[PDB]
Design a protein around this ligand. Structure first.
Ligand SMILES: [Fe+2]
Ligand SMILES: [Fe+2]
Lengths: 192, 192
């Protein structure tokens, strides 16, 4: 029932910050696999016709892992852009200043979250039910929406996300992520 | 006070099954970093002068993660050899046949454990202190000795173990592992 979404940009659009080869493997093999495995697992189960978000909220095991990874990568592609980088603007910028003190403090907090996460996972900027901004990392496929928190931005820190381009140097990859970060998408997410 | 152990063979000794480049990054950077971070964390703490096994059994958080990974990687290098591959012999072979039915069923079981483990981790052949052989995988840095089980063989399934050589294709890497598996080490562990 689920499909691999097209990338929001060309395979070479994030160069030289994220390579074409990485996008070929990361989207064309890793994400594609999650979609295919998800579809097979949920066939003939209560999750067969459920929305993706509802599968994530109610499932466990392989169904959860593939469903959550599918959502997580779909979200991740929109968090980057050839037009990305620079600073946020408007109320997102204002809210970041209020919550974290400044943009550089927030960036440092997200960078540390991403760099210090042990093993596979995701670094997140989220909004809680009270509208308060928060930085946190999750293990493997886990997604903050299972704790009632809305994702605004994510950075994949599974080793496949960067090993082709930076090998073991995850911090260099996170710096590369900042050069392509799509603030327009983050702000769109912030404003609902 | 811990030290990066020397690799038991030359950097090209596992070619073409595991590349020189992989061993340069995996041992020379990944393993080296675990040893260094371990030493910094344990200094000034009750774990400073403890044996590595005791640090693993009594610590948590970053100390555990770095202590366990240091142990795991050291163990992992001896589980491979340029003279490796082929079949086990003697008591080990007999014990494998008794417990799992045959060598190929054991290989299938270990292969599936290694291939199916979601995220970063380790596939293991262990012996419980009843003496029974068991195949299982652990998440991230976790080591079966905390459950009183003695490791006999391990295969690192963190993406850095193979991404340079097989990219997303972990199954191909596990086949490459079987060509260099060091049964002499596994049997030594089995018998002691
Ligand atoms: Fe990913
Ligand atoms: Fe490793």
């Amino acid at each position: 029932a689920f499909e691999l979404p097209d990338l929001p940009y060309k395979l070479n659009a994030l160069e030289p910050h994220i390579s074409q080869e990485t996008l070929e493997y990361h989207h064309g093999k890793h994400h594609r696999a999650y979609v295919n495995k998800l579809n097979k697992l949920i066939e003939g189960t209560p999750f067969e016709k459920e929305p993706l978000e509802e599968i994530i909220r109610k499932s466990d095991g392989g169904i959860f892992n593939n469903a959550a990874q599918h959502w997580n990568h779909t979200f991740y592609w929109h968090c980057m852009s050839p037009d990305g980088g620079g600073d946020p603007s408007g109320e997102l910028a204002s809210a970041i200043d209020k919550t974290f003190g400044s943009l550089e403090k927030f960036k440092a907090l997200f960078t540390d979250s991403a760099n210090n996460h042990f093993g596979s996972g995701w670094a997140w900027l989220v909004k809680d039910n009270n509208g308060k901004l928060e930085v946190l990392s999750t293990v493997n496929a886990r997604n903050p929406m299972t704790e009632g928190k809305k994702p605004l931005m994510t950075c994949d820190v599974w080793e496949h996300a960067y090993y082709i381009d930076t090998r073991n140097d995850r911090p260099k990859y996170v710096n590369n992520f900042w050069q392509v970060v799509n603030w327009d998408f983050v702000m769109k997410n912030f404003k609902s």
